[PDB]
Amino acid sequence: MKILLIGMGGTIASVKGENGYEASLSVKEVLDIAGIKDCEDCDFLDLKNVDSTLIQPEDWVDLAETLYKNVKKYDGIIVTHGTDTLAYTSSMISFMLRNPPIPIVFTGSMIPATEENSDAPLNLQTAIKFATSGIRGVYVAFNGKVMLGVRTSKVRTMSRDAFESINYPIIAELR
Amino acid sequence: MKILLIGMGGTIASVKGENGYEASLSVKEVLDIAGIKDCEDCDFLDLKNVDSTLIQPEDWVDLAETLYKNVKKYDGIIVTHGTDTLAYTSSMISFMLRNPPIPIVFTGSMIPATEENSDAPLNLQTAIKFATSGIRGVYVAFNGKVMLGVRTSKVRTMSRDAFESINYPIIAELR
Amino acid sequence: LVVN
Amino acid sequence: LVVN
Amino acid sequence: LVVN
Amino acid sequence: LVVN
Amino acid sequence: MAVLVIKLIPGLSGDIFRAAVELGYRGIVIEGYGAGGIPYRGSDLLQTIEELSKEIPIVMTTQAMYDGVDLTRYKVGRLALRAGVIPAGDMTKEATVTKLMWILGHTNNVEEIKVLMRKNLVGELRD
Amino acid sequence: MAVLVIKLIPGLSGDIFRAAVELGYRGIVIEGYGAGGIPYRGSDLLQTIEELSKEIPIVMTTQAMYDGVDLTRYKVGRLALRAGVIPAGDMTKEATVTKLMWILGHTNNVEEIKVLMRKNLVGELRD
Ligand SMILES: N[C@@H](CC(=O)O)C(=O)O
Ligand SMILES: N[C@@H](CC(=O)O)C(=O)O
Ligand SMILES: [Cl-]
Ligand SMILES: [Cl-]
Ligand SMILES: [Cl-]
Ligand SMILES: [Cl-]
């Protein structure tokens, strides 16, 4: 029912400017541009707006605190993030927040939502479908697949199917 | 026609003794135990007998020198090796010996040839089939697949299908 | 601070 | 969306 | 043994 | 040194 | 806090690990070959680790994508266990690193850290 | 000769690279994220590399299994190029390391080493 989306940045929320400088969108704008319409009664917090290569440990603290503040209020949380360090973030968060009462789903995209063939809509559709599932825990949603956050790794640098559940069954996938 | 097999050790040539100490077989014994029968007019050199974790750069020098000495004499060379650093060896050899006139094929196994369900026969059958191919270059043969040596990586630690050609088409496979 |  |  |  |  | 991740390659000298400890790194992750182990033929690696593994935790993961580490499978592995190395089981590289950093935030006792790293906290490990 | 391979993780301090160079490592490989780049927000990494990348070659590979590195794709990447980092293209981690060690055996000139690392010698690279 009530779903909070937290922005962290990443390609998902990008629109490279007319010279060579990446610029960032708010998470709310990202959803509108992706074209997610079912998502009503959805709140939006913007926490960072960086390329995830820039992610430092302190960011995990900010993010966990934010999350801890919001678990009792929301039924599912989604966090948009750069793919580069997504699995680091997802894993670390999994240790800080040992027993989440709600699904906390990380996602992102390789092609920015603004672009024509972006993987953003699918990833977000996926993330939202699962955020409503009632499945407690920290997850990653990518390329129509949901993975335990603490078993996910980036395996491809230039493909939509960038992630894999390693040594552990995929939790769910649209197949 | 004339094929030289060089032993470097590895699980392939193992038979753990009755207490917890790995012992090693000669490459020639390994073939007999695997059960390779077609291989006649095949010579056998034993160069090392170590677990490949122990492999140091100096070993690449010994091995390249040996190889350089034997390319003009043989039509194909096969090198049995531990899987742990096989891809390091295969790659480094590829740089030292820039233009081999013959196929030089690395192989090994995850299950020792002495064991009942060993992958050794297949790997060796594969290595030998390809050593006769007339395809110049340095390769790796594993799980019925032949890969460019300089594009091969160990991807699994506890499976027969331990290797993959990365970012590059498989050269050949028994399929 | 949240947008609805 | 499918689990197994 | 098969190439492609 | 080689075995045949 | 600070953890250093080093990929095990041939000819790797244990002197860098010494420097790491000096610098005040509080944990070290060695990304090794296959099921796991430390080179002892022609390197001071295993020796150096024997020393440091009691000051800071030293964790062994694998370079290979799948199946993870098992130091009991081979002798180079079993030696590393004896040397005080903490195995990473079937954890992802990222779950291993972050688990380590997390545990470090809570303790500095290498034996505790070892018990913790071997315990399945959230689904990261098959113990 | 001696090459050090370090996995890029968050909070990674460029001080270890300094120590490496001191120790006499003649090449450094950084296994970074995705398509490539060096952190500059809240770390001295990029700065430190700007310094060292002219003394020893500093090579960027990726932690990800497939597709390899492209420093031109993102700004963190493009910065690393400017910083003097040598990209590893689509090479395997093992082909990268061994190619580096091999080139090092032949020269110590970082510009030569850079031209070489970018040249497809035997099929290791798509250049
Ligand atoms: N460089 C981007 C990669 C992506 O989002 O696909 C990031 O991780 O922030
Ligand atoms: N530990 C063995 C692994 C194998 O051969 O399968 C080695 O690489 O020598
Ligand atoms: Cl893409
Ligand atoms: Cl096996
Ligand atoms: Cl430090
Ligand atoms: Cl040294």
Residue numbers in the entry:
A (entry chain A), B (entry chain A): 1 to 175
C (entry chain E), D (entry chain C), E (entry chain C), F (entry chain E): 1 to 4
G (entry chain B), H (entry chain B): 200 to 326
What did the authors write?
Variable temperature solution light scattering and/or SAXS experiments have provided important findings about influence of temperature on protein shape or association levels which expand our understanding. Previously, we provided a detailed structural and mechanistic insight of thermophilic l-asparaginase from Pyrococcus furiosus in its full-length (PfA), and a conjoined functional version (cPfA) (domain architecture shown in Supplementary Fig. S1). SAXS and crystal diffraction data analysis brought forth that despite lacking a 19-residue long linker which connects the two domains, namely the N- and C-halves (N-PfA and C-PfA, respectively), cPfA adopts a solution shape and crystalline state that is comparable to wild type full-length protein PfA with improved specific-activity. In conclusion, the findings reported here provide structural evidence in support of temperature induced higher order oligomer formation conferring stability to thermophilic proteins thereby regulating their functioning.
